[PDB]
């Protein structure tokens, strides 16, 4: 996605400890249940990761509430799970199937671009023809 | 009232102007028969002749009032452009019309334009404006029909044509992208009043049109629009808000007064009978008391016109020099009325221009009440004026930055420019004017780097070797699919480089061009003519041939044939030369054909292609250029004869015999020997004469490079395309380099066209009709 | 010609008459003599960057035209847009 800062050079630096795991000494101490948080959706609020969630689940890919989120990483610490990590990491991709959309850059940034543009074509014209009516009209006949 | 208004066919006599000019005073040369030239006529000669159109339409039963609460409140006179003034015996013909009969809280407001016509072809309009007083409420005969300004709007997004294509009037013609494009609106309106405050049937009925970049005005769209009961004008009301009138007259910052040191005073008559009979403006109002004392008049006052007539002779006498065909308009209000025998002082001042002609405003106040009589101005065309452009040899590191920081006009030209440059060439122009480097390395690094490479392998030029002929080879052979960067030298700056100077030059003087034709500084009827590298800039500014991104692209290729047209040698240099030879300031007695003759002699025995390339001066500079040792032996046989001093045959005739073309053969002969004797790179060896021109390498404007313009021809033919050339915007007004006549299209100027260049191009064009 | 022949001609003329002229003389004698004393221009501009052709204008008017200058009683403005700025623009002092 880009433009984030050492976001994405913090989380890649996260998977060594798969490997790490095994070489080192901490395997009977620690064990790693890591996961791929996928699209979550926001609060309800006001984003541009929100927005687009509806159009980019018509590619038939899954978008995630914040509750339906944690109930996939309170299902990583069911008693059966915590055993499977206590053998070896545990790799849990709960990304949403967005893993196959390509150009998913590309992609969102034109579902902000479609979703903006209607904005200000549809606000600019609706301000142009109020005041389009009020010069044919009068400014004397808007107290309605 | 909706019809136009004849008034018959009306003649001009010696007369009726002489008993004009005296009843208004106006001694200027031009209106008085001489012996020699023909007679004009004034301008305030149309109100005489068209005074039975314009007064006819105060008269319909729909335009009421009466005639005895009449005022005439303006009168303004406007020549059609290309226009020449009435003649002595001219017959002319005029047609008036109403535009307007709009009701205010006092009277009503007539606004009549009659247009004068000789011989079909129409010379001048006046437009007059009446004032009914009363109060009147016959509103269905009301209407306004105007033309309304050309307002200029930009979209720079695409909801600007959303908005605009969301309105029902808006017809859009051609489907074309308009982003971050310019739309002009030529709209007129046609109004019916209701009450005074609404509207009862509004027409707007206009056009919308594109300027496309191969300088072509297209119409894109069609405003149609036709309502009626409203309340004000939506076309109007979103061009106001949107984009910006244009055709404007530009005001100076501060105005001039004009006439300093003198008082302009125009005391009024002591009757009105003889202006009244001089233009038959015959009511009783301002001859007979009985009439104006029972129209409420504080007296038998003075004709309007009569206001107007004498204070444009003063405009006529002290902003044009009394000449009568610089005064283009002139309007006047009257303000306040004149009673006669009063005295009365104006105030001519300059205060603004637009297309090329002067605002004079002028306005006229009583000396004793000081009240203001009468506000109006003029349109004095300037001096007729001459734009020569200058070629190269003379540039400075940061010419025109001084104006590219201070004019917004001068810089979105060379701004516009130099992203041509970068994104085609990869170099900034603007880099090279603000500080000459020496080297300046073009890189061809990513995908958009590879591409301005393909750019220097894809241009071509031609030459000939000792024997052979057109070669067609790449003008950067070292320019292939392997190279990543190329590197341009140059050890006096890179302004000193012809390729680089050549746009840096045409690009500053089309800066400084349209910084002047935006305040509007520049006439209509001017011509001009460039030396030898400007006359590509005269036509892009005054021409208007090609936009200012082809016309980098054609000047920076043909400084690029100017230089690799030259067999250079181990290094930069070569074997050909330029000089600056001056036939006075040594040997007293020559002219331009007694050194036409020399520089021939030399050009016959011992041949080597010397001539003289420029005629700037005559008898005082001529640049030639040839070969070093051909043009060594110029500045050692003319500058020989003031030292061992003998002065040429030609002092007052040559002798009988034809010795002079062989005498001094051996004086040319004996120096031609002694130039085989110096070294091939051959040193400059200035004398007395000629000025050692440096930096100078190829023969410009000879005949040895007379090969290489088959392809510089077939590369201006696709930057200058046909649809572009104007053709009224060049004849008459451009004068070339090559024919010193102006341009013009007549089938005898093509023939020196043809024996200067021997071109089958305009040969067969030459054997027709 | 007809007007939509004119541009035709034209523009074979014109590109014809810049193609051959840097393979041709620059005559400047000439052409001084054309916006002088065949168009009686009271005022030449030079736009460019120097007077180099604004100074050799004014060395042409006084070698063949200061009695024709004076006959015909016409005032010769020889201005040149690098130092002439006042007087081109009419921009002059509020004296």
Known sequence: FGSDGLYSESKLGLETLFNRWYSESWSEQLTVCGAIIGWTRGTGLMSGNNIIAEGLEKLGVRTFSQKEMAFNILGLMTPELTEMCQNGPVVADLNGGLQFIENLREYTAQLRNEIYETSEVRRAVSIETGIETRVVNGENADAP | ?769 | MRPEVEQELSHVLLTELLAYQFASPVRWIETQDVFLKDYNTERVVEIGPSPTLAGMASRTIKAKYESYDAALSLQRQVLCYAKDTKEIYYTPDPA
């Open chain 2, 1 to 769: 009232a909706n019809k136009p208004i004849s008034g018959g066919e009306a003649s001009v006599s010696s007369q009726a102007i002489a008993e004009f000019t005296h009843a208004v005073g106006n001694s200027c040369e031009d209106f008085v028969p001489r012996a020699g030239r023909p007679q004009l006529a004034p301008m305030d000669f149309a109100i005489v002749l068209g005074w039975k159109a314009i007064m006819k339409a105060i008269f319909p039963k729909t335009v009421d009032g009466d005639i005895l609460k009449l005022v005439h409140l303006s009168n303004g006179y406007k020549m059609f452009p290309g226009a020449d003034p009435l003649k002595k015996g001219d017959v002319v013909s005029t047609v008036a019309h109403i535009r307007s009969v709009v009701n205010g809280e006092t009277g009503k407001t007539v606004e009549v334009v009659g247009v004068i016509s000789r011989d079909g072809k129409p010379v001048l309009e006046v437009n007059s404006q009446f004032f009914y007083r009363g109060k009147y409420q016959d509103f269905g005969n009301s209407f306004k029909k105007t033309t309304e300004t050309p307002v200029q709007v930009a979209f720079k997004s695409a909801k600007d044509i959303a908005v605009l294509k969301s309105k029902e009037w808006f017809h859009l013609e051609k489907d074309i992208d308009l982003l971050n494009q310019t739309l002009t609106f030529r709209c007129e309106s046609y109004v019916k009043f209701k009450s005074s405050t609404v509207f009862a049937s509004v027409k707007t009925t206009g056009q919308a049109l594109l300027e496309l970049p191969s300088k072509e005005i297209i119409q894109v769209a069609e405003i149609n629009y036709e309502s009626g009961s409203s309340y004000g004008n939506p076309v109007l009301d979103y061009l106001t808000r949107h984009g910006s009138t244009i055709e404007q007259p530009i005001m100076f910052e501060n105005a001039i007064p004009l006439a300093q040191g003198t008082e302009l005073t125009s005391k009024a008559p002591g009757t009105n009978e003889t202006y009244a009979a001089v233009s038959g403006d015959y009511n009783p109002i301002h001859v007979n008391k009985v009439f104006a004392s029972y129209a409420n008049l504080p007296g038998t006052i003075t004709h309007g016109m009569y206001s107007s007539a004498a204070v444009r002779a003063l405009v006529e006498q002290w902003a044009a020099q009394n000449v009568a065909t610089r005064v283009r308009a002139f309007k006047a209000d009257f303000v306040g009325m004149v009673l006669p025998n009063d005295e009365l002082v104006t105030h001519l001042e300059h205060v603004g221009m637009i297309n090329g002609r002067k605002i004079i405003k002028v306005e006229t106040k009583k000396v004793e009440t000081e009240e203001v009589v009468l506000i109006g101005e003029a349109e004095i065309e300037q001096p007729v004026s001459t734009f020569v452009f200058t070629g190269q040899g003379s540039q400075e590191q940061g010419m025109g930055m001084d104006l590219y920081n201070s004019s917004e006009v001068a810089k979105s030209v060379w701004d516009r420019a130099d992203v041509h440059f970068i994104n085609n060439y990869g170099f900034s122009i603007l880099d090279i004017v603000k500080n000459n480097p020496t080297e300046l390395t073009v890189h061809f690094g990513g995908a958009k780097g590879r591409s301005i490479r393909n750019n220097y392998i894809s241009m071509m030029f031609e030459t000939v070797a000792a024997d052979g002929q057109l070669k067609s080879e790449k003008i950067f052979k070292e320019i292939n699919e392997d190279t990543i960067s190329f590197t341009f030298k140059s050890p006096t700056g890179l302004l000193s480089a012809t390729q680089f100077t050549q746009p840096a030059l045409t690009l500053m003087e089309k800066a400084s061009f349209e910084d002047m034709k935006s305040k509007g500084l520049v006439p209509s009827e001017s011509m001009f003519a460039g030396h030898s590298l400007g006359e590509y800039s005269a036509l892009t500014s005054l021409g208007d041939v090609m936009p200012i991104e082809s016309l980098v692209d054609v000047v920076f290729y043909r400084g690029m044939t100017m230089q690799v047209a030259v067999p250079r040698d181990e290094q930069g240099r070569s074997n050909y030369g330029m000089i600056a030879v001056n036939p006075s300031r040594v040997s007293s007695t020559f002219n331009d054909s007694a050194l036409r003759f020399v520089v021939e002699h030399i050009a016959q025995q011992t041949g080597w292609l010397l001539e003289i390339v420029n005629y700037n001066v005559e008898n005082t500079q001529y640049v030639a250029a040839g070969d070093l040792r051909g043009l060594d032996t110029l500045s050692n046989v003319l500058n020989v004869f003031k030292i061992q001093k003998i002065d040429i045959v030609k002092l007052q005739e040559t002798i009988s015999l034809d010795e002079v073309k062989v005498h001094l053969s051996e004086i040319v002969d004996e120096v031609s020997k002694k130039s085989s004797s110096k070294p091939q790179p051959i040193d400059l060896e200035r004398g007395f004469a000629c000025i050692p021109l440096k930096g100078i390498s190829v023969p410009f404007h000879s005949s040895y490079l007379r090969s290489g313009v088959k392809p510089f021809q077939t590369f201006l033919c696709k930057k200058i395309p046909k649809s572009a050339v104007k053709p009224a915007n060049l004849i008459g007004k451009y004068i070339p380099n090559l024919t010193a006549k102006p341009f013009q299209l007549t089938k005898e100027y093509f023939e020196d066209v043809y024996e200067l260049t021997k071109s089958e191009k305009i040969k067969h064009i030459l054997d027709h009709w």
